[PDB]
Design an enzyme around this catalytic site. Structure first.
Site, PDB file in Angstrom:
ATOM      1  N   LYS B  50       0.879  -1.166  -0.032  1.00 45.79           N
ATOM      2  CA  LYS B  50      -0.187  -0.029  -0.098  1.00 45.79           C
ATOM      3  C   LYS B  50       0.799   1.276  -0.020  1.00 45.79           C
ATOM      4  O   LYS B  50       0.298   2.300  -0.259  1.00 45.79           O
ATOM      5  CB  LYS B  50      -0.783   0.004   1.111  1.00 45.79           C
ATOM      6  CG  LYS B  50      -1.952  -1.152   1.118  1.00 45.79           C
ATOM      7  CD  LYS B  50      -2.756  -1.001  -0.218  1.00 45.79           C
ATOM      8  CE  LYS B  50      -4.224  -1.835  -0.241  1.00 45.79           C
ATOM      9  NZ  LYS B  50      -3.842  -3.132   0.438  1.00 45.79           N
ATOM     10  N   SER B 273      -2.303 -12.705   3.275  1.00 46.58           N
ATOM     11  CA  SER B 273      -2.560 -12.727   1.635  1.00 46.58           C
ATOM     12  C   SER B 273      -1.210 -13.228   0.850  1.00 46.58           C
ATOM     13  O   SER B 273      -1.489 -13.956  -0.105  1.00 46.58           O
ATOM     14  CB  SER B 273      -3.118 -11.387   1.630  1.00 46.58           C
ATOM     15  OG  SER B 273      -2.327 -10.848   0.362  1.00 46.58           O
TER      16      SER B 273
HETATM   17 CL   LIG Z   1       0.740 -10.680   3.099  1.00 45.22          CL
END
Ligand SMILES: [Cl-]
Ligand SMILES: [Cl-]
Lengths: 4, 319, 319, 4
Positions: B50, B273
């Site tokens: 991000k 993730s």
């Molecule tokens: Cl991750």
């Protein structure tokens, strides 16, 4: 739920 | 970017350390006949992908005249990494940042944002993420100087990945990518990298990952799931579905198992993730057609942020 | 090293991502007439400078025939970053790792090591770090296959900094260093960088930092202090005092204040010791003789590891 | 004290  | 060898120059600001991340072959965990390359977004300066979206929003909006330091207030609803990266860059750019999130969130999530002097507005626990979203919209609607980061729709998001993440991957793999796999949160990473790869003439297959427990892209119903960072429970406007060759569901428990195995096998320490992305990459790599091919995926965030979550509870319990 | 542009190639193992870290000018926090450059060791793959020492011990000892994967057991007493980096690299190199530390240590310190499958032996709280040191010595004394990492005496420690950290700094600053400042834990970073700088012909002044509350290099008595990562309370054999031009004491509370200010001013998020190093750099930078000169110091570790410590309690309390 |  979501964690963004 | 422009390209800037960080290993040979002195940066003028920490935002020049964002992107140009390493890439790493999966080795002991990869028991298949395909190469698997991990784009190490965990190595960004605030420890996740991000940071690229944060920088793109501040840089591109200022350049277009939509943000003015000391006047604009940047607002977003986020209990994860977007709020961190927005808080971190807003501080050094002279923006007031307000992040909304439910009251029930861990002290770590609230405290990391206040370190960087963001204002955190806590919404009622019973309303969940919906309540935090509504509060961010009302704050921006009421105040002319308050604007939404808008991570799920902003044109800056896919664009930064097309201009940086995707051309880095292309150079690192020596113009050789047969499949690019990424979990979709906002969809920026998958969409921007898929755009760059196609502009370079790559025939890579583009695979979107989502949680089995919230299989929205696959046509199912949204629901709560464990895979932090992906699976928003709607199709984000950033995501360009026309570029996707396959949507692959990964179960939260396969993501969690894979994360734990990755640390010990290859020394890669990441969140849920990055476990889901690697599980999916290994699944593709088992397909006989992928013999000798190069699969690229992403490690979106560093593991230390998750030490308190379900992710490493099995280790916590053991300890 | 050898030099290896991580931004343009795919690494074969995560240990190739160690070192070749960025360097960053201190900007908003620097209100002086001197340049201050921060060597960003927080950007190592396991988030601190000890990744260089870990790699050096495994790589150089194996090469010399003193470690044999699956036979040697690497043992060390550490409640900080050395134990982390040893645990992380031992896992991917096929070494059993045992780290000793008091029973009283936070769940985070114990749990981070078990993620990487290290064995953690907890020693009685009342015996403090002395008890953990004694347990590591006994384990190594009793077992022929068990050997001590020996972070405070190993010749590998200054050597890695001389071969990598110091030549990176030299290239990044374009062969222009007037002062190099570092807190001394094991003394490796200061000793190795000072050696490289002198071999390159630099007249840089070499400044060692220690906590005011444990001013051992300065000739005072050891004592408990807050500045995690430095101030062992003896003079480590690694440290070559003949290279030091000045020992500067920094109080734990100045380190803590400076860390908090750095996040908001420049976006640098680090531990106590990066606060102490920056406090010391700014103090030197105020000296009139340093006008227009370049001061280099180190940000040894990333801040996220410290979220639970006294360091950010003021923010914790506020939250 | 020390944590190294
Ligand atoms: Cl991750
Ligand atoms: Cl630090």
């Amino acid at each position: 739920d979501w964690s963004i | 970017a422009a390209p800037f060898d960080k290993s040979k120059n002195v940066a003028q600001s920490i935002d020049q350390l964002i992107g140009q991340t390493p890439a790493l072959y999966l080795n002991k965990l990869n028991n298949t006949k395909a190469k698997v390359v991990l784009k190490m977004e965990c190595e960004n300066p605030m420890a996740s992908v991000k940071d690229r979206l944060g920088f793109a929003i501040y840089d591109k909006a200022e350049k277009e005249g939509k943000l003015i330091p000391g006047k604009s207030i940047v607002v977003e609803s986020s209990s994860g990494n977007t709020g961190v990266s927005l808080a971190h860059l807003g501080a050094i750019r002279g923006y007031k940042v307000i992040i909304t999130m439910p009251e029930s969130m861990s002290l770590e999530r609230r405290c990391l944002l206040r370190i960087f002097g963001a204002e955190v507005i806590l919404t009622p626990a019973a309303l969940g993420m919906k309540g935090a979203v509504a509060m961010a919209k009302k704050i921006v609607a009421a105040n002319p100087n308050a604007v939404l980061a808008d991570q799920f729709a902003t044109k800056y998001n896919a664009l930064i990945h097309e201009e940086t993440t995707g051309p880095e991957i292309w150079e690192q793999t020596n113009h050789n990518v047969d499949c690019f796999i990424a979990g979709v949160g906002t969809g920026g990473t998958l969409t921007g990298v898929a755009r760059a790869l196609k502009k370079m003439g790559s025939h890579a297959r583009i695979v979107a990952v989502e949680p089995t427990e919230s299989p929205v892209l696959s046509g199912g119903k949204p629901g709560p799931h464990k895979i932090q960072g992906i699976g928003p429970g709607f199709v984000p406007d950033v995501l360009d579905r026309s570029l996707i060759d396959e949507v692959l569901c990964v179960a939260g428990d396969d993501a969690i198992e894979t994360a734990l195995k990755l640390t010990r096998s290859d020394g890669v320490f990441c969140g849920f993730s990055g476990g889901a992305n690697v599980y999916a990459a290994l699944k593709i790599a088992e397909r006989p057609e992928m013999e000798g091919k190069t699969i690229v995926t992403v490690i979106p965030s560093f593991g230390e942020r998750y030490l308190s979550t379900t992710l490493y509870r099995s280790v916590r319990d053991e300890v």
